[PDB]
Amino acid sequence: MDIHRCRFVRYPASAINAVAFTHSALPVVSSSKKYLQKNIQVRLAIGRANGDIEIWNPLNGGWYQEVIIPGGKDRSVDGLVWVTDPDEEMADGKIIHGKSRLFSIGYTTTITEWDLEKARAKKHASGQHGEIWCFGVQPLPAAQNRKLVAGTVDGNLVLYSIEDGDLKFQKTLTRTPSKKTKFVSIAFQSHNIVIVGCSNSTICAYDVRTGTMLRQMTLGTDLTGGSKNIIVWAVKCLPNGDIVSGDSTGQVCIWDGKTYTQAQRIQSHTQDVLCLSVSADGSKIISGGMDRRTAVYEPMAGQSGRWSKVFHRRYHQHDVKAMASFEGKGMSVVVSGGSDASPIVLPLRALGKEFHRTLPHLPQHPTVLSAPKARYILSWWENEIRIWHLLNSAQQFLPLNLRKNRKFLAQVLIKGASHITSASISEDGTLLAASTPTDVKVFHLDPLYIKKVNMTGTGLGATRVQISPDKRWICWAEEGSKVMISRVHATESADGISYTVSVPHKLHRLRRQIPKHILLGGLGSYDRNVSQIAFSADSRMLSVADLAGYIDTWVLRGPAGERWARNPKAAMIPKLSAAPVVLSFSPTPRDDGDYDLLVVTTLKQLLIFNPLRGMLSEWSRRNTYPKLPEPFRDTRDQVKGIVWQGQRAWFYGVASLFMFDLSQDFSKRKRGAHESGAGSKIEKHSLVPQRIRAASAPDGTKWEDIEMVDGSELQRLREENRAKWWHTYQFRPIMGIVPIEGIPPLEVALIERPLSEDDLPERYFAEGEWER
Amino acid sequence: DAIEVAGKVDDVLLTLNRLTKSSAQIIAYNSKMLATKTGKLLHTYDESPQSLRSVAGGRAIVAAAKEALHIGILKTKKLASWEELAYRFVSFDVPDIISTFDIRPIIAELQDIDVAVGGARGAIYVYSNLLAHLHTLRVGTIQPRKYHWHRRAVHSVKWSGDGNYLISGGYETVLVLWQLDTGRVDFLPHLSAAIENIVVSPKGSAYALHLDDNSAMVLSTAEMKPSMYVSGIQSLVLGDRPSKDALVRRVWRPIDEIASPLVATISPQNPSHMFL
Amino acid sequence: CKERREIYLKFWEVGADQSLELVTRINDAHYTKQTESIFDLASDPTSARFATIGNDGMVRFWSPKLRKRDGLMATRPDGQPLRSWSCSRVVPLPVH
Amino acid sequence: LTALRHRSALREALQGRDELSVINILRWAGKYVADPRYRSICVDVAFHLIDLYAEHVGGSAELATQFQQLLAKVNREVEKAELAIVTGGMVESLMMSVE
Amino acid sequence: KNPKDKRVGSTAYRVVSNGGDPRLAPKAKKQSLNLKQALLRRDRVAKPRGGFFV
Amino acid sequence: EAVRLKGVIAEAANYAKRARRALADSAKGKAMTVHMSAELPLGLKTDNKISTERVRSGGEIVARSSRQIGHFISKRRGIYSIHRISEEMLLGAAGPTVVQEAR
RNA sequence: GGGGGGAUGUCCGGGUCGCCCUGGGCACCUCUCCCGGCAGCCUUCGCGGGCAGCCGUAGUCCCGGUUCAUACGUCGCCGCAAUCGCGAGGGGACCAACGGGUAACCGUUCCUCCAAGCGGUCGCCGGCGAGCACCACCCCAGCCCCGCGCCGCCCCCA
């Protein structure tokens, strides 16, 4: 197996600015009502300064990146708030969880709410003012009258109305007196009582209902640097009503909230606070400061409200721009996303007691592709699609010539201002396709000369796209859920080959069986958007797989009488336990004419289908999930891609690397542990005492360890019907691995993205707070 | 310790005596128990035992193991008889080697304690609500606050005065006053040598500094001119306690060694004066 | 490091309040192709004279004269002259 | 500089330099290698420079000049070092004729 | 971009335009963003970006 | 002139020694950067192997992690290379053969 | 590192010619004990001693890929006494080195004389003014920066 280590791709990381959990806490239940709290869809949104918003599942410590909505050039995001209704109870006592709406901004005078099914901008709304900087929705105390409150540059609190799928500027509450009073932070003390933190060192407590100014809190001069007027950067309110406010001298103020004044001034960071977060019972305060620092707060026991800075840490590489809490269903975390593009999850209730976890900054979809016949490697971001050629083998080089071995071949631009979702290529690379959520464009290429092959029928734009191996069929995922296909016809002439696309022919997915309270509650029909699309090696059977784990397959009925029919065994093909993170045909043909469909879901669930039979392969009948090797089973790396060999399937997440000889069968991170959702327990260096021993028998001999707390016949038949696997961690930040040609020998492109201080945005220091 | 035997308080002595190198045991004594040379064995613990001290009255004691703390609550109330001196002892690992510690009581009773450990790692952990963390099988989470200044070994952490302030003296020649109600730290930075030992006066008014180069100065608090000075011969010493900072295998390792005669002379025209 | 050593000789006047005041530093009191590590020093019990022996092989005799460049006398503000010591005599030593 | 050698830190002070800075430090050290009142410190810091930045001189020719110009002055400094001791013997050796 | 206005000098003739923000997202005010970055780095200065480079 | 050449050759010799060391570990597979061509790189620097120990604050020493070691290895990987894996490595027997670009 | 072995791949005499070997070249894995450091436990007041010890090299579930830095006490003007420097500008030497041009030579750096003026340091039994306030508040202009409209020029096609 030959490997090319490729760093030279400059995939741009961007600053996370916003982090929004759907819910923050759920009311606790016992294990007997786990089935009650089971179907509550819990998602986590994160927004990036290239206007990227993305939807993640925490997935019980799983952290699967599911959906990416790209935003165009000179478009970004700053604030993010989910809007979750309380649960509706049906006429039979059945429950309907809240339809969750998701709202963001664009550094503008413009709010926009995001539809998640069609996976683009549902709505916009704009009251006339300066630029909206901070916003949140009124909490519950009416039941259906809930409203946005947005603070902006010039001052005027605007009040926006969201009732029954609406988003409209209701009115202006008030504006501040002066013109230099800029608003930066907003949070709600109670139902009617809003708190804004604002530019001239002030914290205004307004009553919203009348719209009056209940009290003006005030802060003093920043006596470290100049620029007198301190800037409250972030405010929240504790669940028992006091107010906490991170500022520009890095202090953290404890305002008694009954009379709206101070009781404590804690010095936390060196540079300025950037975000606060709180436990939902009101017991853990997390401070995040521009000196790439996170600090952690618990009350000084005893006298009232004297909080304390238990400890701090330097977590990220660049500073922590936003962080948000969540606590429930056996999971108690807080996510800090910063400018170094790396969301880190922290264990809220296990802090100092459990290791944090860095997610990959890279998209879960691998975003790299290649034509091995053409030996053309490529990737894409915002609008530029870049292609390199390798021109050469490896064994030829088996040094001085590697510089010319790699080659910046092409970099193509896209008209308009959309950002590119996905792209598909022919195996010889002559044919290219680009999927924006407004348009899809085809490109013919010649060893170079390009031409823009034109698409008809579309104009609404797509998230996924796949070119058939025979280069006859083009299938896209448009509006996420609506997969369409067209034939492409290759017409040869004396100048060469050209290509014409037919009308896009819509094919229809299957009406599954889902309860209507499930269809209404949560996010709604969100999961329907197809995650992945896989052609057969002969392009004779296509399959799709959505976020719900439903898989839908189609066969090709030839006679142009070629037309794709629904596979009748698609009814037999069942829906998974979790999200199908990879799905591909084996290129190796069967002996019965069936295909073999490799499937992995994010719970490290490995399997393979005989789709024409609508049932599993017999090797999959043999090998079960616990039969998997533990290096596969305990990695917590969401497995990013497979590559194929003859009898082997190599797997790569972000970090690790695997291979499996699928012909054969099979014979540290503890498994019995019950944790909060980030990583595995500390073994050496923690501030908590891990062993505490009591002693009776004053001669010391007797001790006590005081604890710390607040298919037998199936495998019989599976063996009555009757290794080579390998793993490593030694390639850490892999964005993408794609095979290339020139148990068979194969070359491959490994492509990594180490994070460099050259890549991240620059640091900033004054004379005072110079680091070490 | 002063403690009531029947209605008569007196001084019990509390020693920590080894039985191996790796372990020791604390034995308490009356005057007359000393006279008969027999003592009450209270707790034998078993990690290279460093220290013991004792709280107001005799309600509790503390002993210092390498990674760990041994805290002793007396069992009964009021100490009716001399023989019912039994202490329910619990132990627990401090995250770093215990260089020193100092207690503070929470009050005719003792309602809780908060005890501060200081470690050669360069850290100062404080423990906040001990008696009710430990009096009640299962107990809740505990977590020291971590206060980190020095790079070298903290020689001595003491609770202050009120109990508002935490003062500290280290190798790096600088006495820190941790604010402990805010986050801040205000400090007397330039001493002639390592701050080796401090104690807080009866009232909060004076500090005593045993400066590691064999001297002592008494300060008043917040005026910081030394109202009192006493120095010694300042020479090179084969020191009995080996070190405070040589516990964790520092890059240059401290060895108590002497490599040269101590260069010195006597003065003609003033024979009372020696230069060294 | 043996090459880059610094060896200073520092001449001090005694303040009878037990104070020390400089009169003269010498930067290379025993020189050969490198600065020579100095072995020892001694005091003439009769007169103000100091004595040095070092790694070069030479013994140097130092004596206090007066800083006086061309007859005028350089004085501290009270008028007291800036006395300065100097290598009065130089002797090489027989080696066998 | 002599303090930043007294405390051993001259390494750490030097290592965080860029191209233009390196050039300026180089031209300075070249400017003052001559005066034997401080040639010790001049040559030591030049040693650290060569040790710490001699890798990218193939990338940047302008410092290579100053690198050469550093060499160039020193080339004329051993001669002054010798030409002294050439006459260095002469002045000492008259002193043995006078007796 | 948008066509600029043609004034007769007395009046103005321009073309309406909203074909820019179709269903994607609104474009930001570059001014407002730089304002935010100013308020972040009020006075303070950047360190050298990377390393040994022209 | 003898002094001149004593200098230049003592340089060359010590460089050659560290270079022999470096090529020994590179053949071993410790995946540092060694020079290929018949000409001296200007900076005679032989990128040393990582000491298994580290100097924390304040002056203390502990063991490096395997993990931080792998971090520094990631640092020392160049821009582009080939990393041929053998069947014996896949068997868990042998080690890799790597060729990095001449940096 | 050494001393050694077992095994990998290799040429030159080679051998019935094959297992490879001896003679020369060897590089590796594995075993061995002596080198260097580490840690525990028993021992003894200590010194020492014993015990079974790891590591000297590479890539991880996550993850120490962390933790960590020295006060206030009062600011400004000018002066002296010692002590050291920069130089505007005017000049020389053309030594060197670099980049061009064969070279002629140019250009840059380097060296150096004199100098208008100018700084810094230690000590002053120098003086001389004020010590929130270089701040609170509002207004008005201004610089730096950044956002957009308008021109000016220049484009090209026309």
- CB contact (8 A) between residue D58 and residue F42: yes
Contact A426, E11 (CB under 8 A): no
Give the closest residue to B182 by CA, choosing from A264, A410, A26, A692.
A264
- CB contact (8 A) between residue B44 and residue A700: yes
> Protein A609 CA to nucleic acid G11 C1', in Å?
56
d(CA A392, CA A633): 37
The answer to whether B190 CB sits below 7 Å from nucleic acid chain G is yes
Contact B135, B179 (CB under 8 A): no
> Which residues of A are less than 8 Å from F80 in CB distance?
4-8, 402-403, 405-406
- Enclosing H/E stretch for B133: helix B130-134
d(CA A607, CA A18): 37
- CB contact (8 A) between residue F57 and residue B252: no
> Which residues of A are less than 8 Å from B87 in CB distance?
698
Nucleotide nearest the Cα atom of A5 (by C1'):
G59
Pick from A267, A301, A692: which is nearest to B92 by CB? A692
Chain-centroid distance of CA A231 in Å reads 31
Contact B215, B203 (CB under 8 A): no
The Cα-based distances of F71 to A263, A344, F20, F77 in angstroms read: 45, 18, 25, 10
The two structure tokens encoding residue A193: 């009582």
The answer to whether F84 CB sits below 7 Å from nucleic acid chain G is no
d(CA A707, CA D90): 89
- CB contact (8 A) between residue F83 and residue A402: no
Rounded to a whole number of angstroms, the distance from the CA of B159 to the nearest CA of chain F is 24
Contact A137, A83 (CB under 8 A): yes
- CB contact (8 A) between residue A708 and residue B128: no
Phi, psi of C82, deg, nearest 5: -75, 85
Burial of A633 (0-12, 13-18, 19+ CB in 10 A): middle
d(CA E34, CA E39): 9
Q: Which of F18, F40, F42 to mutate to test the interface with D (most CBs of D within 10 A)?
A: F42
The answer to whether A181 CB sits below 7 Å from nucleic acid chain G is no
Contact A185, A196 (CB under 8 A): yes
Instruction: Give strand G nucleotides closer than 7 A to any protein Cβ.
Output: 27-29, 38-44, 46, 55-72, 81-83, 95-99, 109-112, 123-125, 135-136, 138-139, 146-150
d(CA A737, CA A37): 38
Sign of the alpha-carbon torsion through A164, A166, A172, A178: positive
d(CA A110, CA A132): 7
Strand ranges for A22-139 from DSSP E: 44-48, 52-57, 64-69, 80-84, 88-89, 95-96, 100-105, 111-115, 120-125, 132-137
> Protein F64 CA to nucleic acid G33 C1', in Å?
29
> Which residues of F are less than 8 Å from D54 in CB distance?
42-44
Give the closest residue to A349 by CA, choosing from A291, A279, A397.
A279
Contact A340, A17 (CB under 8 A): no
- CB contact (8 A) between residue B250 and residue F55: no
Contact A545, A532 (CB under 8 A): yes
DSSP E25-43: -PPP-HHHHHHHHHHHSSS
d(CA B119, CA B155): 8
The two structure tokens encoding residue B72: 């002793």
- Enclosing H/E stretch for A328: strand A322-328
3-state secondary structure of E15: coil
The two structure tokens encoding residue A547: 């976020």
Asked if chain A contacts chain B via 3 or more Cβ pairs within 8 Å, the reply is yes
d(CA C87, CA C30): 11
Contact F35, A694 (CB under 8 A): no
Pick from F37, F78, F85: which is nearest to A3 by CB? F85
Contact B30, B12 (CB under 8 A): yes
d(CA A294, CA A288): 5
Window 37-66 of D: residues touching F by CB (8 A cutoff) are 54-58
3-state secondary structure of C32: coil
The two structure tokens encoding residue B18: 């080894």
Give the closest residue to A103 by CA, choosing from A89, A116, A86.
A116
Give the chain B residue whose CA is nearest to the CA of A688.
B143
Contact B30, B10 (CB under 8 A): yes
> Helical H runs in chain F?
2-28, 66-76, 87-90
The two structure tokens encoding residue A617: 């392969």
Contact A380, A366 (CB under 8 A): no
3-state secondary structure of B44: strand
Given CB atoms, is F59 within the 8 Å cutoff of chain D?
A: no
- Enclosing H/E stretch for A476: strand A473-478
The Cα-based distances of A131 to A150, A405, E32 in angstroms read: 10, 50, 7
Sign of the alpha-carbon torsion through D89, D92, D94, D96: negative
The two structure tokens encoding residue A287: 């401070």
> Which residues of E are less than 8 Å from A108 in CB distance?
26-29, 32
Given CB atoms, is A8 within the 8 Å cutoff of chain F?
A: yes
Q: Indicate the DSSP class of residue B58.
A: T
Given CB atoms, is E54 within the 8 Å cutoff of chain D?
A: yes
> Which residues of F are less than 8 Å from D56 in CB distance?
43
d(CA C38, CA C52): 8
Q: What share of chain C is helix, strand, coil (3-state, %, to 5)?
A: 0, 50, 50
Q: What is the dihedral of CA C62, C68, C69, C71, to 10 degrees?
A: -140
d(CA A644, CA A598): 10
Residue type, A15: A
The strand order across the sheet containing A615-616 reads A580-585, A597-601, A605-610, A615-616
Rounded to a whole number of angstroms, the distance from the CA of D12 to the nearest CA of chain E is 15
Quick count: other Cβ atoms within 10 Å of Cβ F87?
10
> Helical H runs in chain D?
2-6, 10-15, 19-32, 39-53, 61-94
Q: Indicate the DSSP class of residue E45.
A: B
> Protein D72 CA to nucleic acid G114 C1', in Å?
28
DSSP A405-452: HSEEEEEE--SSS----EEEE-TTS-EEEEE-SS-EEEEEEE--EEEE
Strand A2-6 to A747-752 pairing: parallel
Q: Which of residues 126-155 of B touch strand G (CB under 7 A)?
A: 146, 148-151
Task: Point out which residues pair with C51 in neighbouring strands.
Answer: C42, C61
For chain B, list the contacting chains (3+ Cβ pairs, <8 Å).
A, F
Give the closest residue to A297 by CA, choosing from A322, A327, A271, A334.
A334
Give the closest residue to A211 by CA, choosing from A165, A255, A170, A182.
A170
Give Cβ neighbours of residue A411 (< 8 Å, ≥ 6 apart).
A384, A385, A386, A387
Pick from A272, A437, A763: which is nearest to E46 by CB? A763
- CB contact (8 A) between residue B138 and residue A709: yes
d(CA A296, CA A275): 12
Give Cβ neighbours of residue A401 (< 8 Å, ≥ 6 apart).
A392
Pick from E32, E39, E49: which is nearest to A758 by CB? E49
Nucleotide nearest the Cα atom of D68 (by C1'):
G97
d(CA A626, CA A281): 38
Q: What is the dihedral of CA A450, A456, A457, A461, to 10 degrees?
A: 20
Sign of the alpha-carbon torsion through A416, A419, A424, A426: positive
The owner of tokens 């999971």 is A331
Chain-centroid distance of CA A593 in Å reads 38
Give the chain B residue whose CA is nearest to the CA of A265.
B182
Give the chain A residue whose CA is nearest to the CA of E19.
A416
Quick count: other Cβ atoms within 10 Å of Cβ A488?
19
Residue type, A86: P
The Cα-based distances of A683 to A531, A532, A669, D5, D84 in angstroms read: 38, 39, 11, 42, 69
Phi, psi of F12, deg, nearest 5: -60, -40
For chain D, list the contacting chains (3+ Cβ pairs, <8 Å).
E, F
> Helical H runs in A100-249?
none
Strand A707-708 to B138-139 pairing: parallel
Q: Say if residue A257 is preceded by a cis peptide, omega within 30 of 0.
A: no
The 10 Å CB-count burial string (b at 16+, else e) for B90-101 is bbbbbbbbbbbb
For chain E, list the contacting chains (3+ Cβ pairs, <8 Å).
A, D
Phi, psi of D6, deg, nearest 5: -55, -60
The two structure tokens encoding residue A342: 């790396």
The answer to whether A634 CB sits below 7 Å from nucleic acid chain G is yes
> Protein A82 CA to nucleic acid G93 C1', in Å?
81
Pick from A76, A231, A272: which is nearest to E28 by CB? A76
Give the residue numbers in D contacting E (CB under 8 Å), as ranges: 18-19, 22, 53, 56, 59-60
- CB contact (8 A) between residue E54 and residue D60: yes
Rounded to a whole number of angstroms, the distance from the CA of F45 to the nearest CA of chain D is 8
Give the closest residue to A567 by CA, choosing from A600, A611, A599, A601.
A611
Strand A52-57 to B226-231 pairing: unpaired
Give the closest residue to A184 by CA, choosing from A21, A321, A73, A280.
A321
The Cα-based distances of C47 to C40, C50, C63, C64 in angstroms read: 19, 9, 9, 10
d(CA C30, CA A77): 74
> Which residues of F are less than 8 Å from D58 in CB distance?
42
d(CA A424, CA A473): 11
* Backbone region of residue A697 per phi and psi (left: phi > 0; alpha: psi in -120 to 50; beta: other values): left
SS (H, E, C) B153-193: CEEEEEECCCCCCEEEEECCCCEEEECCCCCCEEEECCCCC
Sign of the alpha-carbon torsion through B169, B174, B175, B178: negative
Give the closest residue to A251 by CA, choosing from A289, A205, A197, A306.
A289
d(CA B137, CA C94): 87
Give the closest residue to A421 by CA, choosing from A18, A158, A54, A727.
A54
d(CA A636, CA A562): 43
Task: Point out which residues pair with A450 in neighbouring strands.
Answer: A445
3-state secondary structure of D49: helix
d(CA F11, CA F35): 17
d(CA E3, CA E20): 13
3-state secondary structure of B110: coil
SS (H, E, C) A74-104: CCCCCCEEEEECCCEECCCCCEECCCEEEEE
Contact A505, A560 (CB under 8 A): no
3-state secondary structure of B3: strand
The two structure tokens encoding residue D5: 């050698």
Chain-centroid distance of CA A436 in Å reads 19
Experimentally determined by? cryo-EM
d(CA A473, CA A486): 6
- CB contact (8 A) between residue A699 and residue B41: yes
Give Cβ neighbours of residue F45 (< 8 Å, ≥ 6 apart).
D55
The owner of tokens 């730290």 is B185
The answer to whether F50 CB sits below 7 Å from nucleic acid chain G is yes
Q: Entry resolution in angstroms?
A: 4.7
The strand order across the sheet containing A273-278 reads A273-278, A285-289, A293-299, A307-313
Phi, psi of D14, deg, nearest 5: -90, -30
d(CA B25, CA B183): 39
The Cα-based distances of A753 to A366, A727, A733, F100 in angstroms read: 12, 20, 6, 17
Chain-centroid distance of CA C21 in Å reads 14
DSSP F56-82: -SSSBEEEPPHHHHHHHHHHHS-SEEE
- CB contact (8 A) between residue E44 and residue A124: no
